[PDB]
Amino acid sequence: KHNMKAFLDELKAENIKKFLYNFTQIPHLAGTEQNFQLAKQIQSQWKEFGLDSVELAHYDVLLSYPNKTHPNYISIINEDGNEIFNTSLFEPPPPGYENVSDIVPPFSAFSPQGMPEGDLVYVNYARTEDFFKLERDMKINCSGKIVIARYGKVFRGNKVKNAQLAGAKGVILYSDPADYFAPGVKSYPDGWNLPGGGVQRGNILNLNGAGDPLTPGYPANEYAYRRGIAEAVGLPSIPVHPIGYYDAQKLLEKMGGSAPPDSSWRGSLKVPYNVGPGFTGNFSTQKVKMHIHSTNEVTRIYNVIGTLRGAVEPDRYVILGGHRDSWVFGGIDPQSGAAVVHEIVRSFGTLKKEGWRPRRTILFASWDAEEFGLLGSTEWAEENSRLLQERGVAYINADSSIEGNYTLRVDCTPLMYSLVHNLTKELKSPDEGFEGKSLYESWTKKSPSPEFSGMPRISKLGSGNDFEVFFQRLGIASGRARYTKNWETNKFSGYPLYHSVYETYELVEKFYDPMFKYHLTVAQVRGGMVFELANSIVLPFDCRDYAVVLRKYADKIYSISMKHPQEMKTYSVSFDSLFSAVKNFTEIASKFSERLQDFSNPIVLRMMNDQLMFLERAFIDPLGLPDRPFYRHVIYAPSSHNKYAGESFPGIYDALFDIESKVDPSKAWGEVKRQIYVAAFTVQAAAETLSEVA
Amino acid sequence: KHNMKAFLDELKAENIKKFLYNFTQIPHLAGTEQNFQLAKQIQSQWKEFGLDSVELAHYDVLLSYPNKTHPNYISIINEDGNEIFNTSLFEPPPPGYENVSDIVPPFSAFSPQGMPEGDLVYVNYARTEDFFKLERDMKINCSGKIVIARYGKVFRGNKVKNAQLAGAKGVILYSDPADYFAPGVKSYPDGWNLPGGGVQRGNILNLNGAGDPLTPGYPANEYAYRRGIAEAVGLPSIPVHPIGYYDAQKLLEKMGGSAPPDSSWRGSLKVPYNVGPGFTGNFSTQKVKMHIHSTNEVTRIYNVIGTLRGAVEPDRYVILGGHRDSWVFGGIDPQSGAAVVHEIVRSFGTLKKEGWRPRRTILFASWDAEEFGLLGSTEWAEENSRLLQERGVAYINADSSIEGNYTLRVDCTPLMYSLVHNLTKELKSPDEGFEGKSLYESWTKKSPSPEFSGMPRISKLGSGNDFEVFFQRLGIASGRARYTKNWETNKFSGYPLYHSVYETYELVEKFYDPMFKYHLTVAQVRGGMVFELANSIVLPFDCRDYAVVLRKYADKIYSISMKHPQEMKTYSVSFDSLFSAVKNFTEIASKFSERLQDFSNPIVLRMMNDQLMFLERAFIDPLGLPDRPFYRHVIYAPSSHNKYAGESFPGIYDALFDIESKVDPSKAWGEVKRQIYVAAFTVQAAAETLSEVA
Numbered sequence A, B: 001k002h003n004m005k006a007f008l009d010e011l012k013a014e015n016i017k018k019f020l021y022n023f024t025q026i027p028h029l030a031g032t033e034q035n036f037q038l039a040k041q042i043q044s045q046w047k048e049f050g051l052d053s054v055e056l057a058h059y060d061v062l063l064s065y066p067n068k069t070h071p072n073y074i075s076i077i078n079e080d081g082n083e084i085f086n087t088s089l090f091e092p093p094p095p096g097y098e099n100v101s102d103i104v105p106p107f108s109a110f111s112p113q114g115m116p117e118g119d120l121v122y123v124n125y126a127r128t129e130d131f132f133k134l135e136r137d138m139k140i141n142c143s144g145k146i147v148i149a150r151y152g153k154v155f156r157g158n159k160v161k162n163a164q165l166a167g168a169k170g171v172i173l174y175s176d177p178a179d180y181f182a183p184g185v186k187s188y189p190d191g192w193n194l195p196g197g198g199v200q201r202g203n204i205l206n207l208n209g210a211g212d213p214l215t216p217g218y219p220a221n222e223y224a225y226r227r228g229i230a231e232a233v234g235l236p237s238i239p240v241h242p243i244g245y246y247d248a249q250k251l252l253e254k255m256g257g258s259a260p261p262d263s264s265w266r267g268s269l270k271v272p273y274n275v276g277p278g279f280t281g282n283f284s285t286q287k288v289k290m291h292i293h294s295t296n297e298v299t300r301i302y303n304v305i306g307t308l309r310g311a312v313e314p315d316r317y318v319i320l321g322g323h324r325d326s327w328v329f330g331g332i333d334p335q336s337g338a339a340v341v342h343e344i345v346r347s348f349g350t351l352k353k354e355g356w357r358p359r360r361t362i363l364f365a366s367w368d369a370e371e372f373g374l375l376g377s378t379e380w381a382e383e384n385s386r387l388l389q390e391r392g393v394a395y396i397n398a399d400s401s402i403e404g405n406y407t408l409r410v411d412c413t414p415l416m417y418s419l420v421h422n423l424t425k426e427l428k429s430p431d432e433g434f435e436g437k438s439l440y441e442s443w444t445k446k447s448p449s450p451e452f453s454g455m456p457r458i459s460k461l462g463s464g465n466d467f468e469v470f471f472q473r474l475g476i477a478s479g480r481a482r483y484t485k486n487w488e489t490n491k492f493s494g495y496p497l498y499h500s501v502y503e504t505y506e507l508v509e510k511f512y513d514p515m516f517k518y519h520l521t522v523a524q525v526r527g528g529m530v531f532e533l534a535n536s537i538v539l540p541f542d543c544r545d546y547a548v549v550l551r552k553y554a555d556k557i558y559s560i561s562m563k564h565p566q567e568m569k570t571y572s573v574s575f576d577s578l579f580s581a582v583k584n585f586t587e588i589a590s591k592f593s594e595r596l597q598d599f600s601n602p603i604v605l606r607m608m609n610d611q612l613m614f615l616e617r618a619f620i621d622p623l624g625l626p627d628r629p630f631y632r633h634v635i636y637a638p639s640s641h642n643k644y645a646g647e648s649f650p651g652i653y654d655a656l657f658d659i660e661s662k663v664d665p666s667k668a669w670g671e672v673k674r675q676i677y678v679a680a681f682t683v684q685a686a687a688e689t690l691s692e693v694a
């Protein structure tokens, strides 16, 4: 039989391993020749595997690179202008890679050039609340200072925006052992911790979903009109550079000024974590100097787009996409994901060669320039937005398949909750102590939901990956899954070797997944989800799951507002309309579910499948959220404080955030009421798409 | 048989006549009790006629009314402040209506209050080019002057915007006999000309598609958040009032200052048409004073929405809509249209009672507050935009069925050209001298197309009626048809009694259409178009007709740019990308037409019908046109100089308009190139929706 079980059994751990090894032997930085060659290899292999068509889709987008003959570095400079300490020019390469060419040295992509000199201020994680604490409570002024911030907690682009708004003239990012060194584990290559010379690369843009900084709204094709650099979207105004903890210790150890306000500001280095500004007595005359010479350059990027045409509904697309570009070797991010995509294509292709076709069209994507701001996925979605708007059933992401070896992690729209629960009950747990049990069982035991008791945790989507344009701009149901760590017992951020030269094939094979069984489980989850979305007669979305979460979010946002009962009385601020809308959605969703169960009629089916497909679409507001025209989903958006986090009822949440500090409360509360109306109206409008159509 | 011929034969001239008489015996001003009562009558009758459901959809929107105890008027005031001449407080009522209550006196809806005094400047039609002529050529400064403008040529709201931008402190609008009195015909009631005491009512907003001024983007429902009046969309900043030509003559006869620049500035009154400013020698000390006391008031309005559910595709909507609110009796505008809609409903209902249903759902609408800025249609479309976006097949408008008795007039998307040609070849001409000939034959002979020789004229759509939100905002294929005058041999504007108390049932029955045969022909055209759109197996849209017009428009916009060959060389301005896109659209459209002809498969059909339905939708840009976010169609928009006119490639056209007068040519030509790219990209994106889907 050609059923989901045939697809699943054809997937092999050994194949994922070989593909990962193949994809990680040299760097594949976006816009380089090696990543173009990798794109052409993937194109050829997907054709061999049996896809109907496989093309490259190219764009010319703004990228950023260090100058090879003018290296970036940071100094401590004395009174006489002698540079008495210098940060490293490269990470010491791992065993056996000491002769590998074209490893990009650590840098902050899209940093402007500059050589600012000044006194340091230490800003913890550079979060909105860290800057509140500095200015409002500690009375420390960042204006004209160089800020040093530890990585972790929030997207690094938000840290830079926060520093810029505080008046900083430069930012230094560093990896603290508190956040990147788990106690009792060795530094790479003897364990999976970040060594003192390790550095996290990464872009520091604030694109808010725009894609290529020069062409917001439109694909960066051959005839595209480009903004001038001064009008580009999301570029930082001050120089930024990342360092490791050996170098950070040299910069932090001399710090004077005010003590850290509390223990939450102290990392694990043997320094006091003084906030500054500047250095203690003996060293007060020394300054910090940055030297940044990176350049931004319009560069060609290449997506691979594979098509497996549906037999019955070829005009309905289920997309499996993940990126291919990496900072260096991409041992986890993204090649552990790309290897899984490759095996999934190979397996679908095996069935296709035996005469099988999915009901709906499956599109497979290898995205380029994800690391430079989701550029490849966003430009292709801008080029194809009308096809995606009217035909896009679901997007399943496929970046890093592992960030740990503890349990499953799923983040997705409520419309996929039931699909994921059902699929994971049919898959085998790969976990020790759960042999013969379902993945649902081990996942639910290890990762209980804090929102719904007895259920597994499923998180929200924000941004920081290639699902963003599909979900937040276009309103196509989206999800993602990977294996993860125990977040409850580990204090470290993400996985420690993220974006460092040490994130290699050996890291994965030796420490994370030697038998490739977690990769195989993730291939089954991602692949199974795609299979069901592309083959199930009735789309496997349950609108009732959206109703239950809308009520949780409505309760949550009301509870935030209710911290201000006097102002809600004064300005007549009522959530009644939102709760009414959510109640109506619950009622209508229930009736629609009844009809869905109670109908041989392919027009009623497809009419109903269209109602299911356009339900996520109904949460889009074509006017977008305030000052963020490419975040158009009213229920979810990436947090304005941290693009990685998904916020619910984001329009109301931002209207309420820090409201007590607004100079004109009547105007501020008016805008909260405006956002309640937009949210209530959108929830009711989405509900009505599920009503009988005539 | 229940076929189009059964539907058409059931329509009766005598029924249209009786409904028109019924709808025009009292005024039905938007927001008044009489128009609510009319709405409830129509609701009841549509149910009786056999529709499946008929509901009222109400909204609370900003309307504007004179103050009943503080009348609007204009004076000539002497030095001592004595008002020596006063304009009329009402139009003398027509025979037999001298006791009719609730006739609103002439006023400009949404005028602010004020009593400005000053010197007059005469500005011809107050068009952009009239103001260019005054400032640039004649060196006449309107700043602080009261402007007097003749009605005609462009939407009155554009005249007011132009006057405001020129610095005027008030505007007087008047009807010149040159534009509202055809030589050789008598004034009402003895003929169809405007008498000297006749005045045209009408709103002077500049909404640019927003709908209710207080709630742009969202329906004005019970919980809606409203903008404060100071933030409202489109309200004029200076007082405005309309007068007739007896009163205009008193204001114009004393005018001094500069002579009219040429004969195109002279109307037909026995005055010199001096431009001013101010009056001749003896009268130089006299001024003009306006007294405007109208108030804007949020008021409830009621649409009637009738549903005739489709038997096969109930989730595909064909909409027949026109307004019901009138300035006074609405003898032509809109009741000659509403009576035709009523007979069309009655006929569809006759077939429904015999067991027939259309393939697709037909929605019938009686819109309220059209005269106050398309408010009823726009608020309902804002409430229902997600249903309309994904299910809306076509909108057919149904305002005034006649503005003359000479030949057919059709304005519509190119996607309906072939539908209209085919339908009119099957209908009988009602014209004298064409008995036994088709409507296509008489129409083509009387109204030859200036764009395609041998074909009948079909115009573009701009705004100024209820199709605007459907076509320009949402991208749903739209069209309209009515009987019209010979435009070639008549100099007058529209029909002369437009928006006056004299536009009555008797005007229509005595002068325009005594046998109601033109109304019947229009009922057949509108009704037949709806029938075909709702019943044809394959949607009756021909994408090849769009290809031919896109090339005409591309030629046209290139020819405008080519008046500036030096600048096109200097700034490297190329239309190659647009022509390439149009060539590709032509090619793809041809192949799609082949496939459409060459496919028992309801999924291929519906897939193909979806491609046809979403083709108009593909021309929408979700970012909208510059500073007009609710005009989103890239091929057509209402002219920025005249909302009644449709402009092609409006983004490029506005970027080129008056470009030689721009201070920074590099920036201006850059924006032309930007608009070429947006247009080329959109044309190619629309083309690709017609490609094989996978």
Ligand SMILES: *[C@@H]1O[C@H](CO)[C@@H](O[C@@H]2O[C@H](CO)[C@@H](O[C@@H]3O[C@H](CO[C@H]4O[C@H](CO)[C@@H](O)[C@H](O)[C@@H]4O)[C@@H](O)[C@H](O[C@H]4O[C@H](CO)[C@@H](O)[C@H](O)[C@@H]4O)[C@@H]3O)[C@H](O)[C@H]2NC(C)=O)[C@H](O)[C@H]1NC(C)=O
Pocket: A577, A578, A580, A581, A584, A680, A681, A684, B055, B056, B057, B058, B222
């Ligand atoms: C959740 O779903 C429910 C439906 O189950 C919606 O209920 C609607 O709620 C609105 C707003 O509260 C009601 O609005 C009121 O309508 C009255 C007229 O209703 C008649 O006409 C409609 C159709 O045209 C029929 O459906 C209806 O049964 C009646 O025949 C108005 O007269 C009301 O205005 C008066 O009262 C208000 C409040 O005091 C005053 O402000 C006004 O000035 C005026 O005096 C009012 O506009 C609507 O009738 C309800 N529809 C129903 C019950 O079918 C909720 O709206 C929905 N939630 C959300 C968020 O959308």
Ligand SMILES: *[C@@H]1O[C@H](CO)[C@@H](O[C@@H]2O[C@H](CO)[C@@H](O[C@@H]3O[C@H](CO[C@H]4O[C@H](CO)[C@@H](O)[C@H](O)[C@@H]4O)[C@@H](O)[C@H](O[C@H]4O[C@H](CO)[C@@H](O)[C@H](O)[C@@H]4O)[C@@H]3O)[C@H](O)[C@H]2NC(C)=O)[C@H](O)[C@H]1NC(C)=O
Pocket: A055, A056, A057, A058, A222, B577, B578, B580, B581, B584, B680, B681, B684
């Ligand atoms: C009307 O429809 C036609 C198709 O019939 C479109 O033609 C495309 O036009 C573009 C832009 O001119 C061509 O772009 C060029 O692509 C080359 C690579 O093409 C290869 O890969 C693609 C798929 O990935 C294949 O389809 C293709 O056959 C090849 O295998 C690039 O190398 C070109 O860049 C080089 O030249 C340009 C121009 O000098 C330089 O600026 C660059 O720096 C570089 O040196 C270029 O990008 C595209 O190949 C065409 N597709 C075809 C023929 O199938 C038109 O675009 C379309 N009109 C509009 C308005 O969209």
Ligand SMILES: O=C(O)CC[C@H](NP(=O)(O)OCCC[C@H](NC(=O)CC[C@H](NC(=O)CCCCCNC(=O)c1ccc(F)cc1)C(=O)O)C(=O)O)C(=O)O
Pocket: A153, A154, A155, A202, A203, A333, A370, A371, A372, A373, A374, A399, A403, A407, A408, A409, A410, A446, A447, A448, A457, A459, A460, A463, A464, A465, A484, A485, A486, A487, A488, A494, A642, A643, A644, A645, A646
């Ligand atoms: O330009 C861009 O937009 C991004 C470019 C690039 N993208 P990427 O490097 O390819 O990927 C981004 C990596 C960061 C991302 N981070 C997150 O998804 C975590 C964000 C975090 N979210 C959360 O903390 C809540 C959601 C996860 C909950 C997970 N916990 C469990 O699954 C779990 C819980 C308990 C337990 F016992 C077991 C498991 C936050 O809010 O900051 C990730 O890991 O993929 C980049 O970020 O530089």
Ligand SMILES: O=C(O)CC[C@H](NP(=O)(O)OCCC[C@H](NC(=O)CC[C@H](NC(=O)CCCCCNC(=O)c1ccc(F)cc1)C(=O)O)C(=O)O)C(=O)O
Pocket: B153, B154, B155, B202, B203, B333, B370, B371, B372, B373, B374, B399, B403, B407, B408, B409, B410, B446, B447, B448, B457, B459, B460, B463, B464, B465, B484, B485, B486, B487, B488, B494, B642, B643, B644, B645, B646
């Ligand atoms: O708020 C609003 O947006 C509008 C509210 C209200 N709307 P309405 O009063 O209910 O309706 C608007 C009336 C004005 C509109 N005017 C037009 O459609 C003409 C506009 C005109 N358009 C044209 O000149 C080109 C299109 C018509 C071509 C017609 N010619 C023939 O059909 C023809 C030609 C030759 C021939 F020998 C025979 C016939 C222009 O550009 O200004 C109409 O008649 O419906 C209002 O305008 O106050």
Ligand SMILES: *[C@@H]1O[C@H](CO)[C@@H](O[C@@H]2O[C@H](CO)[C@@H](O[C@@H]3O[C@H](CO)[C@@H](O)[C@H](O)[C@@H]3O)[C@H](O)[C@H]2NC(C)=O)[C@H](O)[C@H]1NC(C)=O
Pocket: A418, A419, A422, A540, A541, A542, A597, A598
């Ligand atoms: C996830 O799996 C659950 C449990 O298997 C799916 O729910 C089940 O769906 C079936 C098929 O529609 C329902 O069967 C129906 O039963 C009623 C009689 O009660 C009958 O009227 C229908 O003809 C049909 O046989 C079944 O009740 C339902 N079970 C539940 C809700 O407990 C669920 O649909 C799956 N979710 C997906 C695929 O997204």
Ligand SMILES: *[C@@H]1O[C@H](CO)[C@@H](O[C@@H]2O[C@H](CO)[C@@H](O[C@@H]3O[C@H](CO)[C@@H](O)[C@H](O)[C@@H]3O)[C@H](O)[C@H]2NC(C)=O)[C@H](O)[C@H]1NC(C)=O
Pocket: B418, B419, B422, B540, B541, B542, B597, B598
């Ligand atoms: C308006 O009326 C015209 C003329 O009747 C319609 O065009 C005609 O459409 C028919 C039906 O699809 C075409 O018939 C086809 O002929 C070819 C053989 O040449 C065959 O392959 C098909 O099986 C089918 O029998 C016919 O050629 C065509 N005539 C033309 C273009 O001159 C047109 O579709 C109507 N437009 C509408 C309804 O929007």
Ligand SMILES: *[C@@H]1O[C@H](CO[C@@H]2O[C@@H](C)[C@@H](O)[C@@H](O)[C@@H]2O)[C@@H](O[C@@H]2O[C@H](CO)[C@@H](O)[C@H](O)[C@H]2NC(C)=O)[C@H](O)[C@H]1NC(C)=O
Pocket: A071, A073, A075, A081, A082, A083, A084, A085, A086, A089
């Ligand atoms: C810290 O570095 C500076 C700069 O050195 C240059 O840049 C490095 C990236 C690397 O490419 C070096 O080879 C370059 O010389 C050092 O200061 C320089 O020292 C040289 C030689 O003594 C002198 O002629 C230059 O003028 C100096 N440049 C500057 C900007 O001062 C400095 O010695 C290093 N400090 C330490 C403690 O190692």
Ligand SMILES: *[C@@H]1O[C@H](CO[C@@H]2O[C@@H](C)[C@@H](O)[C@@H](O)[C@@H]2O)[C@@H](O[C@@H]2O[C@H](CO)[C@@H](O)[C@H](O)[C@H]2NC(C)=O)[C@H](O)[C@H]1NC(C)=O
Pocket: B071, B073, B075, B081, B082, B083, B084, B085, B086, B089
């Ligand atoms: C022009 O009208 C003014 C104002 O008259 C008032 O408003 C009219 C709409 C109507 O309602 C009249 O009955 C009102 O009196 C006339 O000037 C007024 O004259 C009265 C009586 O003589 C005097 O007491 C008021 O002060 C005047 N008001 C003003 C504003 O001047 C004026 O006579 C009329 N001129 C002509 C030539 O008819």
Ligand SMILES: *[C@@H]1O[C@H](CO)[C@@H](O[C@@H]2O[C@H](CO)[C@@H](O)[C@H](O)[C@H]2NC(C)=O)[C@H](O)[C@H]1NC(C)=O
Pocket: A021, A022, A023, A025, A040, A041, A044, A045
């Ligand atoms: C990754 O795998 C690919 C696919 O097998 C290898 O590419 C092939 O290499 C052989 C020998 O050089 C060529 O003859 C084929 O044309 C290649 N096939 C392609 C590109 O599709 C590639 O060598 C592997 N890379 C590494 C680093 O192991």
Ligand SMILES: *[C@@H]1O[C@H](CO)[C@@H](O[C@@H]2O[C@H](CO)[C@@H](O)[C@H](O)[C@H]2NC(C)=O)[C@H](O)[C@H]1NC(C)=O
Pocket: A067, A068, A069, A070, A295
């Ligand atoms: C990268 O840095 C190099 C080295 O400093 C730059 O090359 C110099 O550029 C100047 C003029 O801009 C020349 O006169 C020098 O001869 C160059 N020096 C060397 C060693 O080649 C180069 O411009 C930078 N690249 C960028 C900014 O893209």
Ligand SMILES: *[C@@H]1O[C@H](CO)[C@@H](O[C@@H]2O[C@H](CO)[C@@H](O)[C@H](O)[C@H]2NC(C)=O)[C@H](O)[C@H]1NC(C)=O
Pocket: B021, B022, B023, B025, B040, B041, B044, B045
């Ligand atoms: C317009 O026609 C309607 C429909 O016939 C008339 O309304 C009816 O009037 C009778 C007698 O007063 C009532 O008993 C019915 O209930 C009405 N039917 C409705 C409202 O659906 C109305 O009188 C006519 N108006 C004019 C001015 O002739």
Ligand SMILES: *[C@@H]1O[C@H](CO)[C@@H](O[C@@H]2O[C@H](CO)[C@@H](O)[C@H](O)[C@H]2NC(C)=O)[C@H](O)[C@H]1NC(C)=O
Pocket: B067, B068, B069, B070, B295
């Ligand atoms: C319409 O005009 C009337 C008449 O001038 C206004 O009524 C007057 O309002 C003032 C205070 O605003 C009262 O003191 C007077 O007694 C009123 N006069 C009369 C004759 O009633 C009324 O306000 C206006 N209506 C509006 C602006 O909506």
Ligand SMILES: *[C@@H]1O[C@H](CO)[C@@H](O)[C@H](O)[C@H]1NC(C)=O
Pocket: A141, A142, A143, A144
């Ligand atoms: C911080 O420092 C600068 C002076 O260089 C000043 O302009 C700025 O307003 C200061 N901010 C505060 C809050 O003191």
Ligand SMILES: *[C@@H]1O[C@H](CO)[C@@H](O)[C@H](O)[C@H]1NC(C)=O
Pocket: A192, A404, A405, A485, A511, A512
């Ligand atoms: C793999 O799992 C083991 C056993 O729980 C654990 O000790 C180890 O830290 C895990 N490795 C990684 C890289 O998370």
Ligand SMILES: *[C@@H]1O[C@H](CO)[C@@H](O)[C@H](O)[C@H]1NC(C)=O
Pocket: B141, B142, B143, B144
């Ligand atoms: C018109 O008049 C006013 C003076 O009241 C002046 O400010 C304005 O700039 C003048 N415009 C021109 C073009 O002279």
Ligand SMILES: *[C@@H]1O[C@H](CO)[C@@H](O)[C@H](O)[C@H]1NC(C)=O
Pocket: B192, B404, B405, B485, B511, B512
């Ligand atoms: C009706 O048609 C006749 C004959 O052509 C013409 O003389 C008359 O002016 C027309 N009436 C109107 C109102 O256009």
